[PDB]
Amino acid sequence: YDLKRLRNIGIAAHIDAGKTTTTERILYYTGRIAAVTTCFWKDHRINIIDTPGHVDFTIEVERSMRVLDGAIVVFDSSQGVEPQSETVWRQAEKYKVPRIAFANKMDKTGADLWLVIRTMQERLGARPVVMQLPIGREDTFSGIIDVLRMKAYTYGNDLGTDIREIPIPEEYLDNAREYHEKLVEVAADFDENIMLKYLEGEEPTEEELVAAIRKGTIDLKITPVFLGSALKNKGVQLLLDAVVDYLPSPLDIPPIKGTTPEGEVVEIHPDPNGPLAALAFKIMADPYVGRLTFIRVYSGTLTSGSYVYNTTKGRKERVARLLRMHANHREEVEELKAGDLGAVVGLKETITGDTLVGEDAPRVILESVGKPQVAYRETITKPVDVEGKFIRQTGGRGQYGHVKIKVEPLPRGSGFEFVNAIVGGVIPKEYIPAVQKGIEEAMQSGPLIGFPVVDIKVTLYDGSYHEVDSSEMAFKIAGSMAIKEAVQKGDPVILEPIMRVEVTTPEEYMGDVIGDLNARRGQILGMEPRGNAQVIRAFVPLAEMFGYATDLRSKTQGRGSFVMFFDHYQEVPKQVQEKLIK
Numbered sequence: 101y102d103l104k105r106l107r108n109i110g111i112a113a114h115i116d117a118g119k120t121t122t123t124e125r126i127l128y129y130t131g132r133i134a135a136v137t138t139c140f141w142k143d144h145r146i147n148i149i150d151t152p153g154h155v156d157f158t159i160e161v162e163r164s165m166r167v168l169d170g171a172i173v174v175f176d177s178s179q180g181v182e183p184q185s186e187t188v189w190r191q192a193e194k195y196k197v198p199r200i201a202f203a204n205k206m207d208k209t210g211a212d213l214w215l216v217i218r219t220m221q222e223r224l225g226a227r228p229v230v231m232q233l234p235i236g237r238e239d240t241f242s243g244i245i246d247v248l249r250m251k252a253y254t255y256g257n258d259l260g261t262d263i264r265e266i267p268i269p270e271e272y273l274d275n276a277r278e279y280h281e282k283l284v285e286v287a288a289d290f291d292e293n294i295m296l297k298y299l300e301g302e303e304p305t306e307e308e309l310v311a312a313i314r315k316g317t318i319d320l321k322i323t324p325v326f327l328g329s330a331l332k333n334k335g336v337q338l339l340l341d342a343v344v345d346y347l348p349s350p351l352d353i354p355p356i357k358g359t360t361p362e363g364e365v366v367e368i369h370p371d372p373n374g375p376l377a378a379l380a381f382k383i384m385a386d387p388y389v390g391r392l393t394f395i396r397v398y399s400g401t402l403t404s405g406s407y408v409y410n411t412t413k414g415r416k417e418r419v420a421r422l423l424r425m426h427a428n429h430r431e432e433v434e435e436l437k438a439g440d441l442g443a444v445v446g447l448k449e450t451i452t453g454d455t456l457v458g459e460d461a462p463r464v465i466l467e468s469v470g471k472p473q474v475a476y477r478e479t480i481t482k483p484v485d486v487e488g489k490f491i492r493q494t495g496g497r498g499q500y501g502h503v504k505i506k507v508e509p510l511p512r513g514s515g516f517e518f519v520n521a522i523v524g525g526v527i528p529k530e531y532i533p534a535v536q537k538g539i540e541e542a543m544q545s546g547p548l549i550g551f552p553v554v555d556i557k558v559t560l561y562d563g564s565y566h567e568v569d570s571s572e573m574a575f576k577i578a579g580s581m582a583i584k585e586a587v588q589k590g591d592p593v594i595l596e597p598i599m600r601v602e603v604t605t606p607e608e609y610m611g612d613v614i615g616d617l618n619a620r621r622g623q624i625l626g627m628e629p630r631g632n633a634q635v636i637r638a639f640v641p642l643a644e645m646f647g648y649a650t651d652l653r654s655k656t657q658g659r660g661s662f663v664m665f666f667d668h669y670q671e672v673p674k675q676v677q678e679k680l681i682k
């Protein structure tokens with residue numbers, strides 16, 4: 101265990117760009133010596149954190165980004181930068197996570213390195229550095245030129261069983277020659293001594309270059325780009341050498357922030373010999389060990405067969421075993437130091453997102469079929485004074501329940517309030533519970549659209565009863581009926597949820613999106629930057645947002661993105677109410 105030799109990476113890519121094939125291929129070359137698979141490359145341990153299938157599911161994505169250190173963005177070189185690529189690309193920036201790119205499918209028809217380099221700076225605002233040059237196109241792609249070391253590689257087949265270093269062929273000797281010089285320029289921007297050498301026509305050393313490019317890559321200023329064909333086993337190991345050469349180690353990135361029990365909010369460093377701070381990010385019920393809980397250790401060591409405190413749930417837990425998932429097998433270990441990750445068997449209360457610390461350690465908390473229908477709520481507007489009355493011969497015996505209540509509207513969000521104002525026993529004390537229950541039962545489904553009635557204040561103040569005919573049932577119905585008429589005669593109004601949205605669209609559609617929203621009864625609050633895109637935010641009724649995704653696309657070329665969360669309830673406009681009633 102060396103902290104510098106760890107590489108926690110994620111593989112982000114638009115659907116079909118080749119995340120699976122790339123990942124699988126990596127496990128194959130890494131192997132011929134799962135939330136978090138592990139493997140080795142040149143004495144480095146690479147932990148491949150699995151990333152969310154659809155980048156749209158925000159919650160998971162930001163968690164993933166948070167647990168991984170570096171990332172590999174995979175592109176389909178016949179398509180260039182795609183929509184999901186942008187989404188996941190803004191996300192990475194949002195979390196300052198170093199990247200490198202892989203131009204996959206260089207064997208496919210239409211595959212072109214330059215389409216990717218261009219689209220990258222065009223759409224994403226990136227400053228790509230060409231690190232390799234292909235040798236051949238589509239069906240003839242067969243080699244790779246390493247522009248930084250001036251080396252060429254040829255693959256004798258699509259099986260990955262033949263690779264030879266060759267001299268840079270003559271037809272590419274000039275092309276490679278200038279990109280090397282361009283490479284040296286970029287490096288010079290991060291290493292003063294390289295510039296001096298550049299100015300006086302002196303070739304810097306690979307170490308200098310690699311170091312410089314690495315520094316740039318980690319600082320989030322450049323983006324090394326590599327290419328190959330996963331499906332045809334071309335470039336895979338060079339891509340692995342890249343992850344070691346440029347992606348960061350737990351040490352190269354900014355410390356994670358923790359909010360303690362007082363809010364002093366302090367940073368926690370990857371010290372193996374310091375308090376134990378860890379986070380569970382994915383739970384999976386394994387069939388051989390039952391319930392696996394994956395975690396990322398930020399600080400201190402976690403040992404097998406020990407106790408840990410789950411600072412989020414207050415609970416306490418026993419760490420039975422510590423497992424490591426490899427390509428084709430499991431491995432059991434006595435520990436997991438800081439900056440490392442693995443599975444933990446034993447936890448019972450810990451769920452996705454919870455923080456775990458050592459027993460005697462700083463209690464810090466690292467984180468905080470039908471058709472889809474809206475959650476409506478009914479309520480009233482003016483105070484009312486009605487009466488419930490159930491009187492009739494049902495079941496041989498008479499029935500008689502009579503209640504008089506005063507219902508009055510309460511401040512939005514005040515809830516419910518019941519008052520017993522009866523006196524002189526006009527209603528037998530034994531029936532009050534019946535009356536109350538009839539009321540809370542009828543509030544479950546309002547008379548306007550059948551949704552829970554809310555923010556009202558009921559007050560039982562009168563009624564009558566029969567010596568023999570009264571009964572609990574009678575007073576339950578009468579209380580029920582009373583409330584129903586209370587809501588009908590109280591100038592009722594439907595309330596609806598108002599979400600606060602967040603739409604990120606390149607300023608090219610600016611006025612288009614902020615125009616469609618208003619068509620959904622929204623209300624623009626403000627705007628701001630976020631790279632090449634603009635972040636629009638407003639209050640849109642949840643009813644108007646159904647299917648917004650397959651709408652924002654056909655109005656942003658799929659380059660649009662949004663997230664929304666409940667904000668408050670508000671009375672629907674008279675027009676909209678009238679409609680709903682139908």
Ligand SMILES: Nc1nc2c(ncn2[C@@H]2O[C@H](COP(=O)(O)OP(=O)(O)O)[C@@H](O)[C@H]2O)c(=O)[nH]1
Nearest residue numbers: 115116117118119120121204205208329330331
């Ligand atoms: N020709 C070619 N096609 C590829 C390559 N990598 C992936 N594909 C194909 O792309 C499709 C999607 O692959 P996949 O790895 O599942 O991508 P994902 O959907 O991002 O996980 C499959 O049909 C692959 O066989 C490549 O380097 N060359």
